[PDB]
Amino acid sequence: LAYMEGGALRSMSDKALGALRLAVADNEHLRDALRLSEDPKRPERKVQFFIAVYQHLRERIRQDIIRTDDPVDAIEQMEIELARLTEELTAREQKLAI
Amino acid sequence: IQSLTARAPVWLAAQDTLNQLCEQSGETLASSNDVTEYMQQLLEREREATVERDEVAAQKRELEKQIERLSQPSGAEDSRMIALAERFGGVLLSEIYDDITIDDAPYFSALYGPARHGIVVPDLSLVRPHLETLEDCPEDLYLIEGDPQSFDDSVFNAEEQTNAVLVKSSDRQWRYSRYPELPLFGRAARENRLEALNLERDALAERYATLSFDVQKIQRAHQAFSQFVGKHLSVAFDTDPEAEIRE
Amino acid sequence: ITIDDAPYFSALYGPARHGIVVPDLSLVRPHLETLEDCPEDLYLIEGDPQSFDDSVFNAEEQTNAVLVKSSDRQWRYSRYPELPLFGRAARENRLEALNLERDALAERYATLSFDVQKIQRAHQAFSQFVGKHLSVAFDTDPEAEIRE
Numbered sequence A: 001l002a003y004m005e006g007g008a009l010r011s012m013s014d015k016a017l018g019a020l021r022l023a024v025a026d027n028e029h030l031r032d033a034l035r036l037s038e039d040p041k042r043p044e045r046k047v048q049f050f051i052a053v054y055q056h057l058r059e060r061i062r063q064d065i066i067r068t069d070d071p072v073d074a075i076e077q078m079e080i081e082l083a084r085l086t087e088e089l090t091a092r093e094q095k096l097a098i
Numbered sequence B: 001i002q003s004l005t006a007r008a009p010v011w012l013a014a015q016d017t018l019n020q021l022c023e024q025s026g027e028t029l030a031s032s033n034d035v036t037e038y039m040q041q042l043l044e045r046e047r048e049a050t051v052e053r054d055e056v057a058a059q060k061r062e063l064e065k066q067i068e069r070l071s072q073p074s075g076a077e078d079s080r081m082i083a084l085a086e087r088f089g090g091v092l093l094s095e096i097y098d099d100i101t102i103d104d105a106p107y108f109s110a111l112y113g114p115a116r117h118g119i120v121v122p123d124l125s126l127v128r129p130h131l132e133t134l135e136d137c138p139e140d141l142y143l144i145e146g147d148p149q150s151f152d153d154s155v156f157n158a159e160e161q162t163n164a165v166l167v168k169s170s171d172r173q174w175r176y177s178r179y180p181e182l183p184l185f186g187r188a189a190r191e192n193r194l195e196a197l198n199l200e201r202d203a204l205a206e207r208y209a210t211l212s213f214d215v216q217k218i219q220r221a222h223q224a225f226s227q228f229v230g231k232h233l234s235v236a237f238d239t240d241p242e243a244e245i246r247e
Numbered sequence C: 001i002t003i004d005d006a007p008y009f010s011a012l013y014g015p016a017r018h019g020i021v022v023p024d025l026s027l028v029r030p031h032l033e034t035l036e037d038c039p040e041d042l043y044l045i046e047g048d049p050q051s052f053d054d055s056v057f058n059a060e061e062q063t064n065a066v067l068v069k070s071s072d073r074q075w076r077y078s079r080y081p082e083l084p085l086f087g088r089a090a091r092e093n094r095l096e097a098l099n100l101e102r103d104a105l106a107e108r109y110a111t112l113s114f115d116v117q118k119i120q121r122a123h124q125a126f127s128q129f130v131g132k133h134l135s136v137a138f139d140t141d142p143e144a145e146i147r148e
Helices: A006-023 A029-037 A043-059 A071-097 B002-024 B032-069 B078-086 B104-115 B189-235 B241-246 C006-017 C028-032 C089-132 C142-147
Strands: B140-144 B158-161 B164-170 B173-178 C041-045 C059-062 C065-071 C074-079
Touching: A006 A029, A029 A043, A043 A071, A071 B189, B002 B189, B002 B241, B032 B189, B032 C089, B104 B140, B104 B164, B104 B173, B104 C006, B164 C028, B164 C065, B173 C006, B173 C028, C006 C041, C006 C065, C006 C074
Parallel strands: none
Antiparallel strands: B140 C074, B158 B164, B164 B173, B173 C041, C059 C065, C065 C074
């Protein structure tokens, strides 16, 4: 993005914030951090929000079965878990039927 | 300078995408040809993992089929044994011997032979009409005559031997039943054994899930590489503009 | 034995289909306790291997099935199987059909491999082009500019 004027950057930021609004509807702490982050005179808050995201995304890892501190690398582990749980669901359905 | 600046953003985005893609892999890419050999290695790993996954899946399916075969009403040839059992006022012999001990279970199973799973019908004349109708049934259906509640032991030409039983099934004909393990009769701990089968299949399913996830990961990596090359090759491995622009 | 009655013979014999024609029965009883690898429900019959008399059954023929008084209070109902243990005649045509299917699969694999080879070659040609002529690819003719 180093070679793009500021107006387009503002537009992408606006669209991303619009998406985040829907995305973080459920959470309250992340929602509050986002609501703080839009003050143009406190830029660091935005950065903090990102940290607050990753930080949060780490605590809810459920590290009991996951290890990757980086949430980006935990998508594979969640996919593994969904596949395993689909197998377990099939087994449970058969057991309930019998 | 303006030409290089115009070229810049495309090159920079390409470099970032390529770096992410390669770092995701253990290897670092340096050429279009190198990307092609990486694709070939990806295909090799995929065509391997799929074979192991299918083999594990076949083993798994066999395990669940075996587990089910022991399920209901009392683990037996319940595919048609059910209808064959309630359609006539009889009771499964295996169920009749459901509570026999694990020790007497092998002896009685060997004694009864292929007739272990038979159905007790004191008349044998209820099945006489329906016999012609039966075209969907186990290739060898077994029936015994007596009181289902208190059936008297089938009279046999039995002859017990060490961990086995000889029997004379018909004139000049002997069947020698070696004491089986984990028999048909005594279907109380056989439920425990099908539980053991479930335990066994747990690891099979775990391994199958790991193989399936590996297959999915390789597929997604290949698709990402394809999309990359679709958007990316035009500027891949080209010189850095930023240094030129600064100079 | 004939193909026609082979399913009948198999249905009649049941699990006793697989049996050894030992006219003595005396080598088994001492060795009976000595048999451990043998099939759990081993079947043995007394008869002459040179001329094996028809085995003893109280057989009644139902439509594509049989009922035999196997023993007292034991009437056994069986159906006609396919590819019976008796009358195999080496069933060589089944082997041939399986070989036909395998050979068709191999031919299909060969054709697909040839197609993959051609696709690989085309890919390598494209890579070669983009490695050596991509820079000037699709660009205009400089002769007009030179003349201008």
